Structure 1
Amino acid sequence: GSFVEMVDNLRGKSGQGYYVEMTVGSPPQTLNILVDTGSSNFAVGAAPHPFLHRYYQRQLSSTYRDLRKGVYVPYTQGKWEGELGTDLVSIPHGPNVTVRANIAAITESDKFFINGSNWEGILGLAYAEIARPDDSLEPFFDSLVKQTHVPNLFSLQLCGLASVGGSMIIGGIDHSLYTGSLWYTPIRREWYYEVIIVRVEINGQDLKMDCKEYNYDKSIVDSGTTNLRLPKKVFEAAVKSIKAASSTEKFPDGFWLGEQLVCWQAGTTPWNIFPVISLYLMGEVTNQSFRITILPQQYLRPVEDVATSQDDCYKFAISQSSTGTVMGAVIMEGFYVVFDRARKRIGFAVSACHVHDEFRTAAVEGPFVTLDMEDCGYNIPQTDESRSHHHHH
């Protein structure tokens, strides 16, 4: 389990995320577990399901312990529930260690497991504050670091239903996985991997919004979300600008809504008419920022259709949010992303696995200096619910 032993430890399907192999219990049960930086629970399918043929069998693990407490996790479009416990956990293609970690055994779920996902669980890599049922349930990566000498850092190379590969390096940075500059942006608060967007450009034109609109009500880096997701005012601005550039094509509404493909004749897709998008992230130095630039190849995603082998067909992978900006697989695929928990920051470098345009490339570039501008962070109104709960830690 060197960094060479962790290179190419991820796999996935397109638009259904990336998974890593983990062994739970003794004797080991090997399971394919989705890597999810936008959540904080380790949870694994643990009863029969029509879309699963393997799951975690608690009864076959001699080292399993029941915490005698349930957890229930509702999402916008489904849910899971289960029994908490602890078991022994290792990553065959990751560090050479075993840890005792919390595991939610998923006993029931709705619209969580889909047809041909090929993962049987979720590895929440975010921080304790967002773990269910409360932040006292220690997340997997926190247990890894407290129990071993593994450095407090991990990095993801996610390479661009269709197969996809990648690398999760645990406790390090592998220079083979990126070229050129590694740029860091501060983690704003340790809950999600929350960051601050100071500027957005579409083919060099500034959206000119109050910078707080970009981060309303947060901006996060989330490997468990497919799209780039944008607060509604920002989404409208961006689509208006993207439509302007590509105006030689008049797409149906449903395309802009992510509901419909649009096609061209095989090999003739007019990429040059779709703009690059640059997101400027707050730099470590107080005046500075740096930009990540994504190609339209990143935000226009291919689906090989069924009455269409003659055609190249695409889905628009930028969608509206009412919960902030989410930089999902659409952003991360271009990049080597370093989650530097130890130093409270997130690095970006251009990935060595590159989905590149004939003329242009996805880029990581700085610094850019701002005499002033602003605090671009948004302060989420504090509920009485969140104010009262004690955090004796």
Structure 2
Amino acid sequence: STGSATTTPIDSLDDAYITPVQIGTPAQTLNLDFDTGSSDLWVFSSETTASEVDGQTIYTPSKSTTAKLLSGATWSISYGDGSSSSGDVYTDTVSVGGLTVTGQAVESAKKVSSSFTEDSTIDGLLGLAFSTLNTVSPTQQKTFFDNAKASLDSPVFTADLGYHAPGTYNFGFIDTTAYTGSITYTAVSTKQGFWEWTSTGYAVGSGTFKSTSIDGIADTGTTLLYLPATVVSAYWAQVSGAKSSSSVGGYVFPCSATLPSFTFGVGSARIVIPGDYIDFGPISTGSSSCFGGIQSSAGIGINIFGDVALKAAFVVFNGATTPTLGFASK
């Protein structure tokens, strides 16, 4: 089997991407944030505290003839941005772009933190990191990809995120028309539960490539590109007036700037992030100070190749016996 679904930016800055997901019988369609940095499929639901729902579409398991309460199971998750959610668990039929899993754990939110409530465009998350990170207790549950894998034509999914435009998530096949050149594959460590790999270096704009190993994760659920402070300083030093703002919480730059590109290494291959991809707009409405798309990972504890990086590439999440990651230009 295979599946293919369009993923769409939630707003004009690509702050996140949503992909429609069918849950239950009859289908209830929710727009989920596909997240290769976590491993829980959770949804706003009929069980979510009423005051914490503000415009999201909810899953109502009582209206699904295939929903079953997973007795005694609970979940609770906290993300790197300080947000969180928790609740109970059902199993139900879940389909993505024509690909169907029966008995998928659907984690129903009883509580969500304010940032989720305040974002009416995201109805939940669909985790695509390794199932070892799944938070369901006392019986850990598998991700959608883990459940589908054996049935897929090939044990892979691909992320092809757009810049200020829709893109595609495919399951079970590689669309050879969706990228240029070849796909360069690189080793993955699953030891921390992530799609963790090592970039071979970077360049800023038209500058020389610096060969240096940068360990990080391929994370579709993180908006920006988080790299070591040395690398980030080298990038922003090329932008007149850019500076790290303690009060804003990262590098900002004059909105009047044209940004340089940023290149990252994948083995001997090179992925070029155009400068415009690194502009995240005014820090507040009407401001001429703009938020940077490349930020320091110092204090995160890991480097994160988020959407800023991934959207410059066609990315293969290869779930073979020994997982790997593939990157191609597009």
How big is the shift at 1:117? 4.5
- Matched residue pairs, number? 316
Question: What one-letter code is carried by the residue in structure 2 that aligns with 1:318?
Answer: I
The secondary structure found in structure 2 opposite 1:330 is helix
Q: What residue is the counterpart of 1:89 in the other structure?
A: 94
Instruction: Kindly indicate whether the alpha-carbon contact (under 8 Å) linking 1:52 and 1:120 is maintained by their aligned counterparts in 2.
Output: no
Per-residue CA shift, 1:118-141, capped at 9, x if unaligned?
A: 120110011111111368311111
Higher Rg: 1
| CA distance 1:40–1:307, change in 2 (3 Å) | closer
Deviation at 1:15, TM superposition (A): 4.4
CA distance in 2, matches of 1:129, 1:181: 31
Change (3 A) 1:84 1:320: same
Cα offset, 1:157, TM superposition: 0.8
Secondary structure in structure 2 of the residue aligned to 1:129: helix
**Structure 2 residue identity aligned to 1:226:** T
Distance, in Å, in 2 between the alignment partners of 1:257 and 1:317 is 12
Task: Specify the SS of the correspondent of 1:138.
Answer: coil
TM-score calculated relative to the size of structure 2: 0.85
Selected match of 1:300 from 259, 272, 279: 279
Deviating more after overlay: 322-331 vs 14-23: 14-23
Residue 139 (structure 1) aligned with residue 143 (structure 2) = yes
2:316/2:325 contact within 8 Å kept: yes
Distance 2:142 2:235 in 1: 43
Note if contact 2:255-2:282 (Cα within 8 Å) is conserved in structure 1: no
- Name which of structure 1's ranges 124-133 and 181-190 shifts more when overlaid on structure 2: 181-190
SS at the partner of 2:109?
A: strand
Structure 2 segments unaligned to the other structure (5+ residues): none
Q: 1:128 aligns with which of 128, 131, 134?
A: 131
Alignment of 1:332 onto 2:324 = no
Runs of 4+ in 1 over 6 A off after TM superposition: none
Bigger strand fraction: 2
**Comparing 198-207 and 182-191, the one that deviates more:** 198-207
Q: What secondary structure sits across from 1:70 in the alignment?
A: strand
The percentage of counterpart residues that share the same residue type is 24
- 2:326 counterpart of 1:347: yes
- CA gap of 1:164–1:116, structure 2 versus 1, over 3 A, is farther
Report the CA distance between 1:298 and its aligned residue: 2.2
Q: Does structure 1 residue 42 correspond to structure 2 residue 37?
A: no
C-alpha spacing 1:341/1:10, structure 2 compared with 1 (3 Å): farther
Residues 52 and 7 of structure 1: CA distance in aligned 2, closer, same or farther (over 3 Å) = closer
Q: Output aligned runs, 1:272-287, within 5 Å.
A: 274=260, 276-281=261-266, 283=267
Equivalent residues of 2:2, 2:153 under 8 A apart: no
Residue in 1 aligned with 2:19? 20
Q: Quote the residue 1:354 is aligned against.
A: none
Contact 1:258–1:317 under 8 Å retained in 2? no
Check conservation: 2:236, 2:243, Cα contact below 8 A.
no
Counterpart in 2 of 1:110?
113
Q: How does 1:311-390 map to 2 (within 5 A)?
A: 314-321=290-297, 322-342=300-320, 344-351=323-330
For the residues of structure 1 that align with 2:325 and 2:211, how far apart are their CA atoms?
Answer: 25
Question: Quick check: 1:158 aligned with 2:165?
Answer: no
Residue identity opposite 1:279 in structure 2: F
Q: C-alpha displacement at 1:171, in angstroms?
A: 0.8
Q: SS state of the match for residue 89, structure 1? A: strand
Deviation at 1:201, TM superposition (A): 3.2
Q: Which residue of 2 aligns with 1:199?
A: 201
**Contact 2:152/2:171 (<8 A) preserved:** no
Q: Give ranges in structure 1 of 5+ residues lacking alignment.
A: 284-288, 352-393
Residue 367 of structure 1 aligns with which residue?
none
CA distance in 2, matches of 1:198, 1:74: 31
TM-score normalized by the length of structure 1: 0.72
1:183 aligned partner? 184
Counterpart selection for 1:227 from 221, 224, 227? 224
What code does the residue aligned with 2:53 have?
P
2:250 to 228, 238, 258: 258
Contact 1:40–1:130 (CA<8 Å) still a contact in 2? yes
Structure 1 equivalent of residue 6 of structure 2: 8
Tell whether the 8 Å contact from 1:207 to 1:238 is kept in structure 2 after alignment. no
Q: Is the 8 A contact 1:80 1:108 kept in 2?
A: yes
